[PDB]
Design an enzyme around this catalytic site. Structure first.
Site, PDB file in Angstrom:
ATOM      1  N   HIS B 101       0.820  -1.217   0.000  1.00 27.41           N
ATOM      2  CA  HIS B 101       0.000   0.000   0.000  1.00 27.41           C
ATOM      3  C   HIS B 101       0.852   1.264   0.000  1.00 27.41           C
ATOM      4  O   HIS B 101       0.479   2.273   0.612  1.00 27.41           O
ATOM      5  CB  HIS B 101      -0.957   0.065   1.202  1.00 27.41           C
ATOM      6  CG  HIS B 101      -1.852  -1.125   1.346  1.00 27.41           C
ATOM      7  ND1 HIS B 101      -3.196  -1.085   1.040  1.00 27.41           N
ATOM      8  CD2 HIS B 101      -1.602  -2.386   1.774  1.00 27.41           C
ATOM      9  CE1 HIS B 101      -3.733  -2.270   1.269  1.00 27.41           C
ATOM     10  NE2 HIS B 101      -2.787  -3.079   1.711  1.00 27.41           N
ATOM     11  N   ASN B 174      -9.929  -3.216   3.431  1.00 28.82           N
ATOM     12  CA  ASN B 174      -9.742  -3.264   1.970  1.00 28.82           C
ATOM     13  C   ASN B 174     -11.091  -3.020   1.291  1.00 28.82           C
ATOM     14  O   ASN B 174     -12.132  -2.946   1.947  1.00 28.82           O
ATOM     15  CB  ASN B 174      -9.142  -4.612   1.527  1.00 28.82           C
ATOM     16  CG  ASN B 174      -7.600  -4.687   1.678  1.00 28.82           C
ATOM     17  OD1 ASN B 174      -6.931  -3.719   2.041  1.00 28.82           O
ATOM     18  ND2 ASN B 174      -7.047  -5.848   1.366  1.00 28.82           N
ATOM     19  N   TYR B 388       2.249  -4.334  11.995  1.00 29.73           N
ATOM     20  CA  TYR B 388       2.111  -2.866  11.807  1.00 29.73           C
ATOM     21  C   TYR B 388       3.058  -2.064  12.713  1.00 29.73           C
ATOM     22  O   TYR B 388       3.777  -1.256  12.174  1.00 29.73           O
ATOM     23  CB  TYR B 388       0.636  -2.463  11.808  1.00 29.73           C
ATOM     24  CG  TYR B 388      -0.169  -3.048  10.676  1.00 29.73           C
ATOM     25  CD1 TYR B 388      -0.466  -4.393  10.639  1.00 29.73           C
ATOM     26  CD2 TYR B 388      -0.636  -2.272   9.633  1.00 29.73           C
ATOM     27  CE1 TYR B 388      -1.202  -4.948   9.613  1.00 29.73           C
ATOM     28  CE2 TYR B 388      -1.382  -2.814   8.601  1.00 29.73           C
ATOM     29  CZ  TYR B 388      -1.672  -4.159   8.593  1.00 29.73           C
ATOM     30  OH  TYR B 388      -2.419  -4.736   7.620  1.00 29.73           O
TER      31      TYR B 388
HETATM   32  C1  HEM Z   1      -7.177  -8.537   5.924  1.00 29.44           C
HETATM   33  C2  HEM Z   1      -6.077  -8.478   5.246  1.00 29.44           C
HETATM   34  C3  HEM Z   1      -5.337  -7.240   5.282  1.00 29.44           C
HETATM   35  C4  HEM Z   1      -5.839  -6.044   5.055  1.00 29.44           C
HETATM   36  C5  HEM Z   1      -7.255  -5.731   4.744  1.00 29.44           C
HETATM   37  C6  HEM Z   1      -4.773  -5.156   5.174  1.00 29.44           C
HETATM   38  C7  HEM Z   1      -4.908  -3.803   4.984  1.00 29.44           C
HETATM   39  C8  HEM Z   1      -3.850  -2.933   4.926  1.00 29.44           C
HETATM   40  C9  HEM Z   1      -3.911  -1.602   4.523  1.00 29.44           C
HETATM   41  C10 HEM Z   1      -5.103  -0.874   4.034  1.00 29.44           C
HETATM   42  C11 HEM Z   1      -2.689  -1.092   4.619  1.00 29.44           C
HETATM   43  C12 HEM Z   1      -2.265   0.308   4.289  1.00 29.44           C
HETATM   44  C13 HEM Z   1      -2.395   1.227   5.497  1.00 29.44           C
HETATM   45  C14 HEM Z   1      -2.022   2.646   5.224  1.00 29.44           C
HETATM   46  O1  HEM Z   1      -2.713   3.370   4.570  1.00 29.44           O
HETATM   47  O2  HEM Z   1      -1.042   3.140   5.683  1.00 29.44           O
HETATM   48  C15 HEM Z   1      -1.868  -2.107   5.088  1.00 29.44           C
HETATM   49  C16 HEM Z   1      -0.537  -1.927   5.338  1.00 29.44           C
HETATM   50  C17 HEM Z   1       0.248  -2.944   5.843  1.00 29.44           C
HETATM   51  N1  HEM Z   1      -0.109  -4.202   6.050  1.00 29.44           N
HETATM   52 FE1  HEM Z   1      -1.834  -5.063   5.750  1.00 29.44          FE
HETATM   53  N2  HEM Z   1      -3.677  -5.830   5.456  1.00 29.44           N
HETATM   54  C18 HEM Z   1      -3.921  -7.081   5.536  1.00 29.44           C
HETATM   55  C19 HEM Z   1      -3.060  -8.117   5.809  1.00 29.44           C
HETATM   56  C20 HEM Z   1      -1.759  -7.995   6.198  1.00 29.44           C
HETATM   57  C21 HEM Z   1      -0.907  -8.990   6.621  1.00 29.44           C
HETATM   58  C22 HEM Z   1      -1.241 -10.431   6.725  1.00 29.44           C
HETATM   59  C23 HEM Z   1       0.271  -8.395   6.937  1.00 29.44           C
HETATM   60  C24 HEM Z   1       1.497  -8.993   7.425  1.00 29.44           C
HETATM   61  C25 HEM Z   1       1.506  -9.916   8.332  1.00 29.44           C
HETATM   62  C26 HEM Z   1       0.131  -7.039   6.695  1.00 29.44           C
HETATM   63  C27 HEM Z   1       1.093  -6.106   6.902  1.00 29.44           C
HETATM   64  C28 HEM Z   1       0.950  -4.790   6.534  1.00 29.44           C
HETATM   65  C29 HEM Z   1       2.056  -3.873   6.623  1.00 29.44           C
HETATM   66  C30 HEM Z   1       3.419  -4.165   7.102  1.00 29.44           C
HETATM   67  C31 HEM Z   1       1.626  -2.722   6.193  1.00 29.44           C
HETATM   68  C32 HEM Z   1       2.417  -1.469   6.119  1.00 29.44           C
HETATM   69  C33 HEM Z   1       1.993  -0.598   7.284  1.00 29.44           C
HETATM   70  C34 HEM Z   1       2.821   0.631   7.420  1.00 29.44           C
HETATM   71  O3  HEM Z   1       3.820   0.796   6.772  1.00 29.44           O
HETATM   72  O4  HEM Z   1       2.555   1.520   8.161  1.00 29.44           O
HETATM   73  N3  HEM Z   1      -1.159  -6.871   6.306  1.00 29.44           N
HETATM   74  N4  HEM Z   1      -2.636  -3.282   5.296  1.00 29.44           N
END
Ligand code: HEM
Ligand code: HEM
Lengths: 719, 723
Positions: B101, B174, B388
């Protein structure tokens, strides 16, 4: 049962050609640096999946939970190590030229340059000096598109026996500003505007043209980026320039002023704006892919290193300061001596480890080369090392394998984040506990020394009066362009200014143009609905530069060669195509080194009317005309009928026509063109019944690159 | 000399004197849209007007045009601290992008609950309809890096930060109701698969490459969310016109200790509308900032994005009553089994002042819950909680990223944490608990005073790495989704698979995906196979299909255009005119559009002003060349023989009509404007072509045709039209 196995550990085997790592596809192309990189390479064939500590992993499908339906446990170190590494994959992107592509190769000097420089890599023609090259755009971030309108960066790292030398240049011979202090101002203006981070990969917005309009020094490079130079066809097909005047010092201690050039073996060629913008849509990786695939094809990028050489006593004999980076040295006055050749022949194995992590800096010179007092270059020297401290995580970025010299590098430096080297001797000079090794090297043994240029003046912040000439070189560049090249310049200014919201910025830029050429200004003004005053229409125009008003080398299509070899031709075919036509076209294309790509309504194989199966390169829908240099349509009743039912395939012909490309039509294929709202065939519409004949005629038409004469009628075409 | 003066210090005004506004920071254009969070951010804002240019140490700069050298033409001096300070800061502007993202846009707003939800949760921000809870929302794509384009085919991210008075609550969702994978350990594999391939970093912002579909073909759990993204859900028209989902089952805990299983939903007031692929792909070329720009301009226009928060609520005792596991994130809860109850309304009404400060630096995490909300044992959600905070340590420079203004809560936040890189706050009390030297302040809070507690759910099992047997159902919900689509939507799903797999080089990967499709629907597979030149076997066409889900074979809510509204208000219309246009036609058109809240944009062969046949001047919105038909919802061509004459010699103006026809958009022609249409290679005017002599009459019919979003009946004829 087998569905169940996909979510259980995978202990069994799971297994025209795709792009592959350089080691897989070109292992026979080698050099000293690639050999040094081999220690860092990994071969997982037959190896167990393991943690970073070397512990074999049994189940890469499931977290450790309290039961198959339970809560994940904090004690799952495998999961947490795996996620943790993933979470920290990204490092900062470069502040400028974030979007780029790299490749390995080598450089060879034609004959020793000992008369002008002591630099080791320019001494011995039998030496193959390894290089790594990164090409880039400038404005856009990491994910932005390749074929934007922009300056292109061109950084070459020469891994010499006497040290790592970096030639960090651009694809135009001048820069936008004179003094490094203005760099953050210029970049902030061109970068996306700070409130909304819009627009990506475009200078077509208010803050850029605001800055241009208040800083006339920028107009020269602006003229270059508004020309078709701003949208190169390929990194293999643009020129390259170090821009700054450097010094070259020979063994006697004699100093020549020097300017570096790269001249491409494959010619200089560009897109047209409409085509380029479409291409950022259909293939934002076009230039990267094209370079990767050209190396895999054997159409290896080749460029000749050139030098403009000026004796020290000639420094003040021009109508411009050679220390001014907004000025170029016309090749009519000072010719470019081709002194060497560079070949790019190996793609990396891992983009991040090599292309992303490579670090270049203009301050990375070697003995035999020295800096000039060009105030842009002097500021650049500070910036490159400083920026790498955060981009690559500390002061040991030179230990990252792509950045290592291939010569020794002993000193008394120590520690810093992620120190790989393990030192065991005295960390200070002078010492006696280790008899003062490593030791300083006398200049006659290769120790770097600065040429003792005189320094006379007062400490001051002041722009040199010899720098204050903003319009003469823009006018020279304008006057050297052909008329099609002049119109594309006008189209560049008009499209870009058309996206500036504040009208006074638009009027102010046009006013600047009136000091370059009046019809340039008038043409842009008309496009923007601006009424030029009569005072403006008679603004005074600069005079000739050392008795020069045009310079042929400044024009792409009039001053440089166009090469047929390595170009790409779309062959539109469906089931029912004449198979012998295709064979005859392909054999002819190959004879001239052109690449024929079969685009068809479906992937896989198409069947010819002869019943043979032909392997398809991709779908018509997936590979639009902007991705190829020319279009040929072979005969075959069922194929042609299928194509006439296909909006995309009909559009393919209309669009290639509008983009001034060569189109070849065999037999019943002409029906397709005739059914379209297109004027009657011109020099670029090759029609024939014999496939071989038609292909030979089609290749000859391609040599001209584009049908410029079609451009007027092309603007009335609905495509 | 004025030319010399531009390379010397600028001591005088540069703004032009007093002799369609640009996008501006939200403080400039909407200062009256306020909230508690924006007020908190006000302390960190700066007005430079009348202020001197200075170093970061506060030292006035006299000459920002020249480095300090030894003479006007000399060597640059190391002692030039002004230069070095300015270049240093610029050299270090960039921080790492988000690992997923990375391409996103943010806006400020506020949330209001409709009625107290006390009977289901204690969460303070769902208690009082009087309160306006400030929010910051960041929309995003997933795969691409920071410069990638808006209108790619991708899942869209939708993270909402609720600045509640008892803590900051992050709902991180999402634009589809499921995810691709079941367990967080798979996340790096899946992401590495969809991301650009590691040898060449190709391709940007696309799943259409070998490694993604290699992973898909070997991990059938991914097939549900792949159906969603291959549909037109994957190319939304606007962030204002898509749905959002927290995907995971969470818990809600009331004051009485009762637990209800819940699923978060966002329902857009402006309806659910998607682009079509050819349009979306052209849009990434001509405006990679399309959604970002659209969102920002919708707020400046006062068409505030509006969304209703919805809850699916499932009592603890009902947990096992479904033909799917509600803890499985590849599973949705059909809205015909469990309805969505709308409980509040979020409105985004202010754009940032500084994209880097607010949008780039904002940190969201699903571990940021508040009392009243708890986690479930969803094994994807559980892994997200770790990720996160961990990622933000390097992205945001350390463990005090919560002190960056946009991330600060608006409540108090006293604790015993200390130090770390860039510590802003200054602490002067005991840094351990328990302590007596400051009487143990700050103090733990009893649960009945609002101190967070985990709901005591039973835990019974064996320490093990094993996928729950209740998760092993990969094809029923993709089938459900497929059968609920109209024929048009079904066709677009087939086109998405076919286009994407057409860019897959290795053929066995293409065939393995097609093979997976035969377990979902045989006609789905067959159509895709035909487009890929793949002959399906007799055994493949007799692969068993799954049965209905708690009696359901179709759910109306799973269809974008059969189960959701289309909203006319905030839509954009191209008005094509040149010199000589009928001015009164433009006026009556503009007023008919303004009547229904539709925005008319005059696009001409040149910017500035066109002059009407009556002689009056019309300010234009931009060039036809610079604003092609993919950037608008519909097209109208007003009367005037001189205007029509010009347009019929304009290749872009003629292509504008052709393209808008092929993209199934509504086209309005007034008087001689139809003459332009007849000259093109287009058929018998259909239901989506409106022809009339009188302008106000024509506009009314035009707007009423615009309500269908697109003219789907035209789809078959459109394929034969020349692009
Ligand atoms: C339900 C499934 C998931 C959804 C709906 C989801 C949703 C999101 C969204 C919308 C973001 C962007 C947030 C922003 O605007 O800054 C994000 C970032 C992220 N997600 Fe997911 N995510 C999911 C699953 C996962 C999984 C399984 C992982 C890892 C184990 C993960 C790790 C991350 C990481 C590392 C970021 C970056 C956050 C940051 O840099 O601040 N996500 N996720
Ligand atoms: C003649 C004018 C200049 C040219 C031709 C030039 C060229 C380039 C090129 C080609 C790159 C990309 C190198 C790569 O692939 O890694 C680059 C990077 C960069 N340049 Fe320049 N540049 C110029 C002026 C400036 C100036 C005035 C500054 C500021 C003092 C500057 C600062 C930078 C920085 C900070 C980077 C990023 C370096 C890195 O992260 O690795 N350059 N330059």
């Amino acid at each position: 049962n087998k569905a169940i196995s996909t979510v259980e550990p995978h202990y069994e085997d799971t297994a025209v050609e795709p792009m592959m790592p350089g080691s897989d596809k070109t292992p026979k192309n080698r050099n000293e640096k690639l050999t040094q990189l081999d220690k860092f390479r990994f071969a997982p064939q037959g190896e167990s999946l393991r943690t970073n500590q070397g512990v074999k992993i049994s189940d890469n499908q499931n977290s450790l939970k309290s039961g198959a339906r339970g809560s994940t446990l904090l004690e799952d170190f495998i999961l947490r190590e795996k996620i943790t590494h993933f979470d920290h994959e990204r490092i900062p992107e470069r502040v400028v030229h974030a979007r780029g592509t790299g490749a390995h190769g080598y450089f060879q000097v034609y004959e020793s340059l000992a008369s002008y420089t002591t630099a080791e890599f320019l001494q011995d023609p039998s030496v193959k000096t390894p290089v790594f090259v990164r090409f880039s755009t400038v404005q856009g971030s990491r994910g932005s598109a390749d074929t934007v309108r922009d300056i292109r960066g061109w950084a070459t790292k020469f891994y010499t026996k006497e040290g790592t030398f970096d030639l960090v240049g651009n694809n135009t011979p001048v820069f936008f500003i004179q003094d490094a202090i203005k760099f953050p101002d210029f970049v902030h203006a061109v970068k996306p505007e700070p409130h909304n981070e819009i627009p990506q990969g475009q200078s077509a917005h208010d803050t850029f043209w605001d800055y241009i309009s208040l800083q006339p020094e920028t107009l020269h490079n602006v003229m270059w980026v508004m020309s078709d130079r701003g949208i190169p066809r390929s990194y293999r097909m643009m020129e390259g320039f170090g821009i700054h005047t450097y010094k070259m010092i020979n063994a006697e201690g004699q100093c020549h002023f020097i300017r570096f050039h790269w001249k491409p073996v494959y010619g200089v060629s560009s897109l047209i704006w409409d085509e380029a913008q479409l291409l950022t849509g259909c293939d934002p990786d076009f230039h990267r892919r094209e370079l990767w695939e050209s190396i895999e094809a054997g159409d290896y990028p080749e460029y000749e290193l050139g030098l403009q050489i000026i004796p020290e006593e000639d420094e003040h004999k021009f109508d411009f300061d050679i220390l001014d980076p907004t000025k170029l040295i016309p090749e009519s006055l000072v010719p470019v001596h081709l002194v060497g050749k560079m070949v790019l022949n190996r793609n990396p194995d891992n983009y991040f480890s090599e292309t992303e992590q490579v670090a270049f800096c203009p301050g990375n010179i070697v003995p035999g080369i020295d800096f000039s007092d060009d105030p842009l270059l002097q500021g650049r020297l500070f910036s490159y090392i400083d920026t790498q401290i955060s981009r690559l995580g500390g002061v040991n970025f030179h230990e990252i394998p792509i950045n290592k010299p291939i010569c020794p590098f002993h000193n008394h430096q120590r520690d810093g984040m992620h120190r790989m080297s393990i030192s065991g001797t005295a960390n200070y000079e002078p010492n006696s506990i280790n008899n003062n090794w490593p030791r300083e090297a006398p200049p006659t043994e290769g120790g770097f020394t600065t040429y003792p240029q005189p320094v006379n003046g007062y400490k001051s912040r002041k722009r040199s009066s010899t720098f204050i000439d903003f319009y003469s070189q823009p006018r020279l560049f304008w006057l050297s362009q052909t008329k099609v090249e002049q119109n594309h310049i006008v189209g560049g200014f008009s499209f870009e200014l058309g996206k500036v919201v504040r009208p006074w910025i638009r009027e102010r830029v046009v006013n600047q143009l009136t000091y370059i050429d009046h019809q340039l200004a008038q043409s842009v003004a008309d496009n923007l609905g601006i009424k030029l005053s009569q005072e403006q229409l008679k603004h005074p125009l600069p005079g000739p530069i050392n008795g020069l008003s045009k310079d042929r080398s400044l024009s792409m299509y009039d001053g440089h060669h166009q090469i047929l070899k390595s170009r790409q031709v779309a062959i539109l075919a469906a089931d029912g195509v004449c198979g012998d036509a295709i064979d005859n076209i392909m054999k002819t294309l190959k004879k001239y080194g052109v690449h024929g790509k079969i685009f068809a309504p479906h992937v896989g194989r198409i069947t010819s009317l002869q019943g043979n199966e032909i392997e398809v390169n991709g779908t018509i829908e997936g590979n639009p005309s902007v991705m190829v240099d020319a279009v040929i349509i072979p005969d075959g009743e069922d194929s042609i009928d299928s194509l006439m039912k296909n909006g995309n395939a009909k559009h393919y012909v209309i669009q290639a026509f509008k983009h001034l490309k060569a189109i070849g039509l065999q037999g019943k294929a002409f029906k397709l063109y005739d059914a379209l709202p297109l004027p009657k065939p011109d020099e670029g519409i090759v029609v024939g019944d014999k496939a071989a004949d038609l292909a030979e005629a089609f290749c000859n038409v391609m040599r001209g690159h584009r049908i410029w004469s079609r451009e007027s009628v092309a603007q009335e075409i609905a495509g």
